[PDB]
Amino acid sequence: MEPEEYRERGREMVDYICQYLSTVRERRVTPDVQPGYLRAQLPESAPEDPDSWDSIFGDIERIIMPGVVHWQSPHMHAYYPALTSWPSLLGDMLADAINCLGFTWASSPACTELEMNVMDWLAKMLGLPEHFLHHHPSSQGGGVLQSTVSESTLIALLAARKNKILEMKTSEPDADESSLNARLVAYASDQAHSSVEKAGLISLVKMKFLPVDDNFSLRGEALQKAIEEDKQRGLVPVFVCATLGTTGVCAFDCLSELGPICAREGLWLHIDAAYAGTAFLCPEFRGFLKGIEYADSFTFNPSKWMMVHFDCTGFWVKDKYKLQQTFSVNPGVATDFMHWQIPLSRRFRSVKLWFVIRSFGVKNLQAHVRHGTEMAKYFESLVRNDPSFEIPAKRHLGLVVFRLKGPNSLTENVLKEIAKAGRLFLIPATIQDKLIIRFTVTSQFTTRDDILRDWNLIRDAATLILSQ
Amino acid sequence: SMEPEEYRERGREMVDYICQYLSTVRERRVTPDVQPGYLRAQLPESAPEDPDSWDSIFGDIERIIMPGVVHWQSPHMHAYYPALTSWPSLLGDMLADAINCLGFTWASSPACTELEMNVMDWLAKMLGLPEHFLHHHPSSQGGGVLQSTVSESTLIALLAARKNKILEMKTSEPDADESSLNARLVAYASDQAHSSVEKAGLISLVKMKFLPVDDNFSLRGEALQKAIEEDKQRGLVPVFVCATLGTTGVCAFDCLSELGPICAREGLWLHIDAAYAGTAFLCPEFRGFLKGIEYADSFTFNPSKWMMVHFDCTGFWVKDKYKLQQTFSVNVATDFMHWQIPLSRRFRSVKLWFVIRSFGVKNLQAHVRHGTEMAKYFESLVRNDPSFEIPAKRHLGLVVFRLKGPNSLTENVLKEIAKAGRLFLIPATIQDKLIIRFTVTSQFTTRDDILRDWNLIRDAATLILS
Ligand SMILES: *Cc1c(COP(=O)(O)O)cnc(C)c1O
Ligand SMILES: *Cc1c(COP(=O)(O)O)cnc(C)c1O
């Protein structure tokens, strides 16, 4: 492609993007396609000669879009949000042209140096302890960007089990690290995201999921019981994942109770706040963040609610030496992030994060969180006024869970019917034995009209199923 | 809060900037003259409470960011291996970042999965990989998935290998803790292997043994067989081999025709690290290094290095997708969350699709052949100067050389070059010898860029040798 033929085609892509994101409401959020739909539409081999750019651009709507789930539609309500924004897009265009790798400070200093400063910005913005900042006198920890909360949670466990094994060796210097690993046990809520179980599966660390209270919150008494029972069998408690904003119903583990136990029992305390983390930009939601000073590590996704496009996960550790001894065999003033992560290579993610924090500024990020929560409150009040439906868990943020009164099958068929037109996107979840509809406020541009429109389609589907 | 007509103008602004930057990159000091700590002083202490201007933000690119940048897109970048961008790759990711769909399951965005599957079948064919690596070959149990790095792809391969062997050892030891069984395992690579292999061992608590190489720095069948027998005798269970095609140091090739049959016979997961060299397998004449590929359980390369797709974009192929999914799940649509460490993944296949379509196989092949020709030319210039030796053969785009005599001569040549930073070079070591690695990077590298860079190097040598 000629620098001439990149200017025009670059321009045509900025126009398309501006059109696509502005008119996203006009899209069927769910694509009407079956598995394998794409193969017969694509040649069986890569083209030998250049395909014309017109043909490639023409294929965006002709073959790509019909298979897309439109995650930027206000009628997307499944999972948790993944929000893009105009600034985020502008940052990555820059980063991807540079295309530098920041494994060491030396490999591209700016890649490392912007990230350290912007991560300090973001720790402040969320009200995290000062011991999670790079540039604080007493602090010996810091923030690093990761691709997902999933890997962040794995890294915390990896750092946790490594530090404990090194400690266990000083008694048994002839024992094999893997053999010592056998004795370890890690805990989370039974509401924990599947990333916790997968971290266990990958690390070969025994994982035990602890029962929750009526608000689906893990309590200090559940952890304290488990610790005593496991130690009784000669198991070695090593790790606790506390979830601030569970996937299912957006419950909050009681951190003020879990934090002090982990500090007393010397257990690595990891905070998974993937979604709810963005809410901590607002001091009025920071209630759930009480006992944070006990956290050994904390993670949240700007890539869920804070309007940074994926990938962009914040990961803070208290002790950057324990993190780096996980990844280095060999334990100067320059920070090398390749020792803070699984891979070697990393890219210049910090630009897009920087542009978003700057382009919006703090108060507008805090107002986005409040407006999204407001739209969830409006949706809640609609559900709660209709006695066909029940809400089995409290709405703290932008997620409302509900179901038809009666058997699971009614709620199942409601989802099935909503799915036929796919004018809003919903995913069947479960708490205990009860099937629920999760309704997540996503788009920053969500209106009260969007919410009522979506509620009416749910009501229409409920009315049709309850008439069979 | 921005607005559509505001975004429109700044996109046009960012487009022109990037055309200028990539177009003029030769004019940049390749490495920056900066000290660690340098950037904090020029940033506020805290995030701005209200929106900053876009002339302010766009200004800070040349003002605050580009000073601290190593220009990886410079023809005068010759350190590590290439990480090549191109206009089609940038345009593909523009679209992907706008859609911002996650593809953890087929359902979460069908296109994100199906475009990846078909383009990964495209790429297997282009590299001349076995058909048992294709999603859509009728007799395949395997397929390709995009990952972020070769590093993580190698970790995954080792995790999949150790999990499969532990599940098997369980059959005759039902009471054995998985972690206890893992203690018996041993994995192998070349002592020329990328640090990612050592790192995968440290993460997984799997014993890693690095094996000696021949005079071409190639790992040979005899060394692996000898290791396996000595380790089996001591109660260790061989589980994994990483065979490297294009080593970091000198771009050597492990003897895959020997290693393959030993791995199949002895029950070792055979993982191929072709991070850099992989892109060469686009050209049939380099597929000699691929001999024995049929024995491989997994294969990984970085389009992200030499194929002009910007980072991140690593291809990872497995023969048995079920052994992969058993690694990642405690217990028709393909769900890529079971082929990787994390749950979430983004629409990386758009930039790959765009690159492969915008160039065609022919132009990508001409790109590889041209980088190789420029390396061959540089080689001829070094070989003609008897002050210099070439202690390992040049198969692709990397030439390694040094001054004859002690390492200080070569060290002082590198120190002399690094004063003006006009070309970025990183030293390696093969045994008792400091070497200069000279990697042909940019797809726009000409003979003049090579001769320019050679002349700086020979000048540095003339100076140091008197
Ligand atoms: C979404 C989510 C995660 C993991 O998301 P990633 O794709 O791994 O970044 C983890 N925990 C909770 C509570 C989540 O909602
Ligand atoms: C560059 C390189 C790697 C590392 O690649 P990442 O994608 O950064 O992990 C691994 N192996 C070899 C042979 C390499 O040349």
B63 and B128 housed in the same domain: no
Q: In angstroms, rounded to a whole number, what is the distance separating the alpha carbons of residues A105 and B93?
A: 26
Task: Answer yes or no: do B177 and A182 touch at CB < 8 A.
Answer: yes
Indicate which ligand has the atom closest to the C-alpha of B272: 2
For residues A249 and A431, the answer to whether their CB atoms sit within 8 Å is: yes
For residues B393 and B216, the answer to whether their CB atoms sit within 8 Å is: yes
A195 and A334 housed in the same domain: yes
Q: In angstroms, rounded to a whole number, what is the distance separating the alpha carbons of residues B407 and B413?
A: 10
The CA distances from residue B280 to A47, B19, B305, in Å, are 18, 27, 11
Largest CA distance in chain A: 72
Indicate which ligand has the atom closest to the C-alpha of B346: 1
Binding-site members of B for substrate are: 81, 194
The CA distances from residue B73 to A101, A263, B29, B307, in Å, are 11, 48, 12, 13
Q: Which residues of A157-171 are buried (b: 16+ CB within 10 A; e: fewer)?
A: bbbbbbbbbeebeee
Q: What is the CA radius of gyration of chain A?
A: 24
DSSP assignment letter at B144: E
User: Which of B1, B65, B87 has the CB atom closest to A110's CB atom?
Assistant: B65
B300 and B214 housed in the same domain: yes
At residue B273, the 3 state secondary structure works out as: strand
Tell me the CATH number at B41: 1.20.1340.10
At which of A370, A391, A422 does a domain end?
A370
Q: How far is B443 from chain A (nearest CA, A)?
A: 12
Residue B40: CB atoms within 10 Å: 13
Experimental technique behind these coordinates:
X-ray
Nearest CA to ligand 1 atom 8: A150
Lookup result for tokens 């304290």: A224
A321 and A383 housed in the same domain: no
For residues B27 and B76, the answer to whether their CB atoms sit within 8 Å is: no
Q: In angstroms, rounded to a whole number, what is the distance separating the alpha carbons of residues B133 and B139?
A: 10
Contacts of A105 in chain B (CB under 8 A): 36
Contacts of B195 in chain A (CB under 8 A): 344
At which of B41, B63, B82 does a domain end?
B82
B430 and B295 housed in the same domain: no
User: Which of B7, B118, B195 has the CB atom closest to A18's CB atom?
Assistant: B7
DSSP codes joined into one string, A179-236:
HHHHTEEEEEETT--HHHHHHHHHHT-EEEEEP--TTS---HHHHHHHHHHHHHTT-E
Site to substitute for ligand 1 among A152, A194, A252, A272, most atoms within 8 A of C-beta: A272
B287 and B208 housed in the same domain: yes
Tell me the CATH number at B435: 3.90.1150.10
| Residue A337 CB–ligand 1 contact under 6 Å | no
The β-bridge relationship of strands A297-300 and A313-317 is antiparallel
Q: What is the resolution of this structure in A?
A: 2.1
Contacts of A184 in chain B (CB under 8 A): 179
Task: Answer yes or no: do A329 and B198 touch at CB < 8 A.
Answer: yes
Task: Answer yes or no: do B342 and A3 touch at CB < 8 A.
Answer: no
For residue B272, list its beta bridge partners. B243, B299
What the block records as the tokens of A117 is: 């400063």
What the block records as the tokens of B380 is: 């001829």
Q: In angstroms, rounded to a whole number, what is the distance separating the alpha carbons of residues B71 and B68?
A: 10
Task: Answer yes or no: do B344 and A67 touch at CB < 8 A.
Answer: no
Burial of residue B360, with CB atoms counted within 10 A of its CB: 0-12 exposed, 13-18 middle, 19 or more buried: middle
At residue A84, the 3 state secondary structure works out as: coil
Query: Counting one residue from A and one from B, how many pairs have CB atoms under 8 Å apart?
Result: 391
A6 and A147 housed in the same domain: no
The β-bridge relationship of strands A297-300 and A268-272 is parallel
Lookup result for tokens 């649509």: B333
For residues B272 and B192, the answer to whether their CB atoms sit within 8 Å is: no
User: Which of A17, A151, A358 has the CB atom closest to B48's CB atom?
Assistant: A358
> Ligand 2: residues within 6 Å at CB?
A 343-345; B 81, 149-151, 194, 196, 244, 246-248, 273, 275-276, 302, 314
A269 Cβ contact partners less than 8 Å away, ≥ 6 residues apart: A240, A242, A258, A259, A262, A263, A294, A295, A296, A297
Task: Answer yes or no: do A148 and B344 touch at CB < 8 A.
Answer: yes
Contacts of B159 in chain A (CB under 8 A): 202
Pick from B328, B213, B319: nearest CA to B269: B319
For residues B123 and B289, the answer to whether their CB atoms sit within 8 Å is: no
Q: In angstroms, rounded to a whole number, what is the distance separating the alpha carbons of residues A299 and A314?
A: 5
Contacts of B32 in chain A (CB under 8 A): 109-110
List strands edge to edge, sheet with B388-389: B388-389, B398-403, B433-439, B427-430
For residue A140, list its beta bridge partners. A319
Provide, for chain B, the percentages of residues in helix, strand and coil under a 3-state DSSP scheme, each rounded to the nearest 5: 50, 15, 35
Cα nearest neighbour of A29 on chain B? B109
DSSP codes joined into one string, A322-377:
HHHHTT-S----S--GGGGSSSS----THHHHHHHHHHH-HHHHHHHHHHHHHHHH
- Boundaries of domain holding B153: 83-369
At which of B82, B116, B134 does a domain end?
B82
Q: In angstroms, rounded to a whole number, what is the distance separating the alpha carbons of residues B30 and A109?
A: 12
Is the backbone of residue A406 left (phi > 0), alpha (psi -120 to 50) or beta? left
Length of chain B: 466
Q: Which atom of ligand 2 is nearest to the CA of B151?
A: 9
Burial of residue A293, with CB atoms counted within 10 A of its CB: 0-12 exposed, 13-18 middle, 19 or more buried: middle
The CA distances from residue B386 to A106, B200, B405, in Å, are 33, 42, 12
Q: In angstroms, rounded to a whole number, what is the distance separating the alpha carbons of residues A305 and A442?
A: 8
What the block records as the tokens of A388 is: 């066909």
DSSP assignment letter at B242: E
Q: In angstroms, rounded to a whole number, what is the distance separating the alpha carbons of residues B77 and B65?
A: 19
DSSP assignment letter at B64: I
The CA distances from residue B105 to B109, B149, B334, B337, B346, in Å, are 7, 21, 7, 6, 11
DSSP codes joined into one string, A126-143:
HT--GGG-SS-SS-B-EE
Task: Answer yes or no: do A10 and B2 touch at CB < 8 A.
Answer: no
A312 and A219 housed in the same domain: yes
A323 and A432 housed in the same domain: no
The CA distances from residue A98 to A314, B69, B205, B371, B436, in Å, are 23, 8, 36, 20, 25
Indicate which ligand has the atom closest to the C-alpha of B192: 2
For residues B277 and B307, the answer to whether their CB atoms sit within 8 Å is: no
Q: In angstroms, rounded to a whole number, what is the distance separating the alpha carbons of residues A240 and B23?
A: 51
Q: In angstroms, rounded to a whole number, what is the distance separating the alpha carbons of residues B376 and B385?
A: 15
At residue A309, the 3 state secondary structure works out as: coil
Q: CA torsion sign, B48 to B49 to B52 to B58?
A: positive
**Looking at this protein, which amino acid is placed at residue A90?**
L
CA of A188 to the centre of ligand 2 (A): 35
The CA distances from residue B217 to A252, B244, B383, in Å, are 55, 11, 20
Tell me the CATH number at B200: 3.40.640.10
Q: In angstroms, rounded to a whole number, what is the distance separating the alpha carbons of residues B310 and B416?
A: 31
Q: In angstroms, rounded to a whole number, what is the distance separating the alpha carbons of residues B312 and A347?
A: 7
For residues B456 and B417, the answer to whether their CB atoms sit within 8 Å is: yes
Q: In angstroms, rounded to a whole number, what is the distance separating the alpha carbons of residues A46 and A44?
A: 7
DSSP assignment letter at B218: -
Cα nearest neighbour of B332 on chain A? A35
B354 and B258 housed in the same domain: yes
Q: In angstroms, rounded to a whole number, what is the distance separating the alpha carbons of residues A215 and A103?
A: 43
How many structural domains does chain B have? 3
Give the E-state strand segments of B120-268 in sequence order.
143-147, 185-190, 207-211, 237-244
Is the backbone of residue B31 left (phi > 0), alpha (psi -120 to 50) or beta? beta
H helix count then E strand count, chain B: 14, 11
What the block records as the tokens of A297 is: 């590590």
Burial of residue B185, with CB atoms counted within 10 A of its CB: 0-12 exposed, 13-18 middle, 19 or more buried: buried
For residue A146, list its beta bridge partners. A313
Task: Answer yes or no: do B196 and A344 touch at CB < 8 A.
Answer: yes
B70 and B105 housed in the same domain: no
Contacts of B199 in chain A (CB under 8 A): 327, 342, 344
Q: Which residues of A333-363 are buried (b: 16+ CB within 10 A; e: fewer)?
A: eebbbbbbbbbbbbbbbbbbbbbbbbbbbbe
A294 and A426 housed in the same domain: no
Give the E-state strand segments of B120-234 in sequence order.
143-147, 185-190, 207-211
DSSP codes joined into one string, A143-188:
EEEES-HHHHHHHHHHHHHHHHHHHHHTT-TTS-HHHHHHTEEEEE
Q: How far is A452 from chain B (nearest CA, A)?
A: 24
Torsion angle, alpha carbons of B94, B100, B105, B108, to 10 = -130
Q: In angstroms, rounded to a whole number, what is the distance separating the alpha carbons of residues A106 and B87?
A: 26
Mutation choice for A interface testing from B90, B309, B334, B347 by most A CBs within 10 A: B90
